[PDB]
Design a protein around this nucleic acid. Structure first.
Lengths: 206, 442, 98
RNA sequence: AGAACCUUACCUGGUCUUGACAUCCACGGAAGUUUUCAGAGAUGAGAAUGUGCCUUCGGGAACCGUGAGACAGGUGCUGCAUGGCUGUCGUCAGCUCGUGUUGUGAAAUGUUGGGUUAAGUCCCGCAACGAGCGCAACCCUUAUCCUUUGUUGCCAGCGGUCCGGCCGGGAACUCAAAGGAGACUGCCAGUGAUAAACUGGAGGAAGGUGGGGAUGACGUCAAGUCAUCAUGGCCCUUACGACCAGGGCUACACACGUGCUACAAUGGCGCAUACAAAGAGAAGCGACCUCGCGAGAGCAAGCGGACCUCAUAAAGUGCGUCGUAGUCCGGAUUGGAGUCUGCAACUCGACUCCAUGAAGUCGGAAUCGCUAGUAAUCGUGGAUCAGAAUGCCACGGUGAAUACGU
């Protein structure tokens, strides 16, 4: 492993940060601790809702989180029911009252993290990896993407020895910083170990 | 429960209809039962559908009322809240909009007395309300003249001013109407505000000659309005212009402004100069004073005046293009709005040509509306006009309306149309005269 | 007479944050000093990136604290009511000193 | 990126067994505070007081304590079962695909050829035509100018000066940080396939990827990490889990790796005195004054910090002396007396003072870095951290030699 994280090289230029707030030397550490603590709860609770992305900002002893998800109905609940259950629990974890914004992700299979966690699901559902992967990669081209890289790695399909497999069609310029890349990883906890899953997505020049 | 065959009863308990009922298969949204029995689960034996407008009147000792979202609504002049009525924790009315101001008298007195009297955004007929609104107006144009917002006393003092003589019976708008009904007969002038708005600031010196309300340009007189809102599109001293006066107005000498701004005006103009020229003039307020102590308005154009007296002071030849007007603030630029007889501001700018390059068709039809006799004729082929007018004149209201008639060539005939410029009149009448001569020579 | 310190992690965000404050302050009472660009603090961070070995392989990170100062000198006691209502975004911290 | 215990995963001894840590059940008490006794330590026993909420009058929530079973736990093995992350060749310039053509086929062609560049960089040619990853560009910083603003930053044009930007004052200038501009072989001359391009010249603060950093392709080494974490399999389940105390990770006939300080007169020593950048600070930095030779201690201002503090930069320059003496070099080592930190400084911190003064008089075979603000040297700060660097990370000051050439 020698490449650099594309989102981590592209934070200050193109891709915005996931948390946006300020602190001194005192409150910064346990602020990060609470930011961690709410995130895994939201992910395990709404893992069936196809959560893509989480934004934290902290308005003056308050918190507003915005979660980008692809499916409206499950995360909103019927007749506005579940988001108020999510309301009080994150305030309980924070110690301050909170606000939750549900952000729709249209064009769902162009998001990297949703593609990654989707293709994680079928490997743990033991359908065969080649068909799963080429189905996951041609779909972005069909709905009009202009870069896609996909990888899985490690004890692949019950193999005794690990291997890596990558597909890529289009144009995925990692070394161009102005290129905009959607990137987040995933892990499949299959019966033989951990499949690693990586997805790079390329949208535009600026 | 929605799409569920279970019922929320008293406290957090849940039950279901005893299956021997006929409405066991036809569940109501609101049920009453006779016997609660715990056998496999909780069962109400004899069940019947009810309408939930029933249970508030018959459980007055049991209803708990929760009022949320207390917001002051203007239209009633009163605070609304959403009430929820419950017994044993059962939400009988999920939401009902009700008058929080009629519910409690403590805070709503302060809220109403502040809102409809101190801010005073009230749709009503009250005479003291009218006069206090006009007093706050005549103070806010004073602040707009001053460009300093310390003249007016704070609104909390106005709240105290109201509160000390509004009796304690007033809690809402209806009580206030009832109170003004019995108090307006004894003291009408008590609620009208006294003249103590300006106290000790020193701005309240404001000179009327330094801040005029009308500008005289030649024979004409143009309206002035004042506004303090820095960075706004309508900010700055705004001249209001009747539309037919456009043919007599010219931009010359107009940037002289009211005399109350000229010091910081010439400071802005002199610091619009680049750094080498700007270094000659230190300090800028002192040199502004030395300029204003010798300059008189309207004797020269503005740029020429700054150039020649600044040359007199230090000997630099500041060129015309050295002065930058984008660096000059917009509120110092005198806003232009063309208005009608009913003060509808049609078009606007901060230079006169922004008006003129957009109003020529509208000024033309304005001339045509007043010219109701047919000097303007078409299909004309032989000179049969007698003495063609040099400068056509009419009168509307208090102002004369001037234009210039001329011939117009049409390639098939000659026509007469109006023009708002003597030069365009000249070339138009020239071309029409040429076509007329060509038609008349054999 | 009032010192408004703005501390943020993005210059692209703190410019409009101080611009909103300055135009709202001059909107209702004027005589505001310009937003002073005051020397930012750079926190440089050296991290060993491999889990077990190769000390000489590291990454470098930094925190930039964009620091602006706004000064108002004259008594402007009516602006302060709407000044607390400007509900700026979470990206910048504001400190008001008298 | 910091072992006195703790860390600690090791040893020995005392100790526990649904457990030190999670979730489910049941019972009782809210929680918590003070005191004493034995023990190296984890127990047992008192006194005080709990008892807030929540009206559906009850309970609920937190917490403690007790017991059963489902269960937990492991820095235990496998990096040759894995993910993730990382080194490496190597910042090397190459690594491929779609379609076509040739060859039965493995494969080739594109990617070879002439030039040319740092570069499959570009041009031309060409059974190839295109495309992708790579290169470069855009990322950051530094090198010059302009616009904006000018606090705590600056002091030129003004005065008063308490001589101190001290003040009034001023926004010029430095500077500060935002937005622009500026360097693109852009222009000229020659060479060169009328090419790409090269050499030289002007202009310019910067001229030929301006300089430095980020950026590491396809992949190699079954490379390193099961002890960062997650993780499949296997192992223990009264012990390979858990608590505590003392010792060990710091030993010592030796051998090597990487550094520090020296062997000195381009120096040592003493005095006077000149010039920075960068960074940190609230359980913190810690002014001044006093006391002590000093380590520091008291007192205690200001500072969440362009203001205040760490904080006197040192080489230097000028004086006086030393005089080639294992020395007025060097400082290891050792004894005593002390200072701070922390429950605690014996093993096993850091520093001061007094006294001593090892080897060492330029390093065999060999071997390393360095192409310019570099090498060498001189100091400074940071992280970790209660206390702890000659290590790392960053910063400035002085500041080189040489490159014929393959």
């Amino acid at each position: 492993g020698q490449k650099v994280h594309p989102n981590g090289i592209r934070l200050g230029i193109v891709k915005p940060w996931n948390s946006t707030w300020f602190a001194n030397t005192k409150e910064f550490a346990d602020n990060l601790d609470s930011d961690f603590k709410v995130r895994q709860y939201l992910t395990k609770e709404l893992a069936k809702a196809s959560v893509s992305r989480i934004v934290i900002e902290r308005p003056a002893k308050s918190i507003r989180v915005t979660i980008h998800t692809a499916r409206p109905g499950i995360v909103i609940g019927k007749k506005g029911e579940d988001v108020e259950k999510l309301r009080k629990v994150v305030a309980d974890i924070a110690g301050v009252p909170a606000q939750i914004n549900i952000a729709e992700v249209r064009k769902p299979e162009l998001d990297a993290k949703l593609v990654a966690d989707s293709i994680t699901s079928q490997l743990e559902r033991r359908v065969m990896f080649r068909r799963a992967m080429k189905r996951a990669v041609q779909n972005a081209m069909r709905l009009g993407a202009k870069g896609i890289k996909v990888e899985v790695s490690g004890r692949l399909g019950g193999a005794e020895i690990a291997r890596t497999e990558w597909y890529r069609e289009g144009r995925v310029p990692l070394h161009t910083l102005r290129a905009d890349i959607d990137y987040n990883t995933s892990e499949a906890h299959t019966t033989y170990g951990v499949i690693g899953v990586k997805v790079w997505i390329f949208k535009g020049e600026i | 429960d929605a799409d569920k065959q279970e019922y929320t009863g008293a406290r957090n308990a849940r039950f279901s209809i005893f299956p021997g009922s006929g409405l066991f298969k036809k569940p109501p949204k609101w049920v009453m039962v006779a016997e609660l029995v715990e056998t496999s689960r909780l069962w109400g034996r004899i069940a019947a559908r009810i309408d939930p407008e029933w249970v508030e009147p018959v459980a007055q000792h049991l209803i708990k009322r929760t009022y949320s979202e207390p917001h002051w609504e203007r239209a009633q002049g009163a605070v609304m809240a959403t009430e929820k009525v419950t017994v044993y924790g059962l939400p009988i009315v999920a939401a009902r909009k009700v008058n929080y101001s009629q519910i409690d008298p403590a805070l709503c007195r302060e809220l109403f007395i502040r809102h409809a009297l101190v801010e005073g955004d009230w749709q009503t007929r009250h005479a003291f309300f009218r006069e206090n609104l006009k007093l706050r107006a005549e103070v806010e144009e004073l602040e707009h003249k001053s460009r300093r917002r310390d003249i007016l006393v704070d609104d909390e003092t106005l709240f105290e001013f109201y509160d000390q003589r509004i009796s304690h019976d007033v809690i809402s708008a209806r009580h206030f109407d009832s109170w003004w009904k019995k108090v307006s007969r004894e003291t009408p002038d008590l609620l009208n505000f006294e003249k103590s708005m300006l106290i000790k600031e020193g701005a309240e010196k404001i000179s009327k000659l330094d801040y005029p309300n009308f500008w005289h340009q030649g024979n004409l007189k143009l309206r002035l309005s004042y506004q303090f809102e820095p960075g706004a599109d309508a900010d700055g001293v705004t001249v209001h212009i009747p539309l037919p006066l456009l043919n007599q107005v010219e931009e010359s000498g107009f940037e002289w402004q009211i005399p109350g701004l000229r010091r910081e005006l010439v400071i802005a103009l002199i610091k619009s100069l680049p750094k080498p020229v700007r270094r000659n003039f230190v300090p800028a307020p002192n040199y502004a004073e030395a300029f204003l102590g010798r300059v008189k308005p309207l004797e020269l154009p503005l740029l020429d005046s700054l150039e020649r007296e600044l040359r007199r002071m230090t000997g630099v030849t500041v060129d015309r293009e050295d002065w930058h007007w984008d660096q000059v603030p917009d509120h110092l630029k005198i806003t232009f709005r063309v208005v009608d007889d009913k003060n509808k501001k049609l078009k606007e700018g901060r230079s006169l040509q922004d008006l003129k390059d957009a109003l020529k068709g509208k000024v033309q039809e304005t001339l045509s509306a007043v010219a109701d006799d047919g000097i303007e004729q078409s299909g004309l082929h032989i000179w049969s006009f007698g003495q063609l007018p040099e400068s056509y004149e009419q009168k509307r209201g208090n102002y004369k309306v001037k234009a210039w008639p001329a011939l117009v060539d049409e390639r098939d005939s000659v026509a007469i149309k109006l023009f708002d410029n003597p030069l365009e009149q000249k070339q138009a009448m020239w071309n029409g005269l040429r076509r007329l001569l060509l038609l008349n020579i054999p | 007479r009032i010192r408004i310190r703005l501390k943020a992690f993005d210059h692209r965000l703190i410019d409009q944050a101080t611009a909103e404050i300055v135009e709202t302050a001059k909107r209702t009472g004027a005589q505001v000093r310009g937003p002073i660009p005051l020397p930012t603090r750079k926190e440089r961070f050296t991290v060993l990136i491999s889990p077990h070995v190769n000390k000489d392989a590291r990454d470098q990170y930094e925190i930039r604290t964009h620091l602006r100062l706004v000064d108002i000198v004259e008594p402007t006691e009516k602006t302060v009511d709407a000044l607390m209502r400007l509900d700026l975004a979470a990206g910048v911290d504001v400190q008001i000193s008298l």
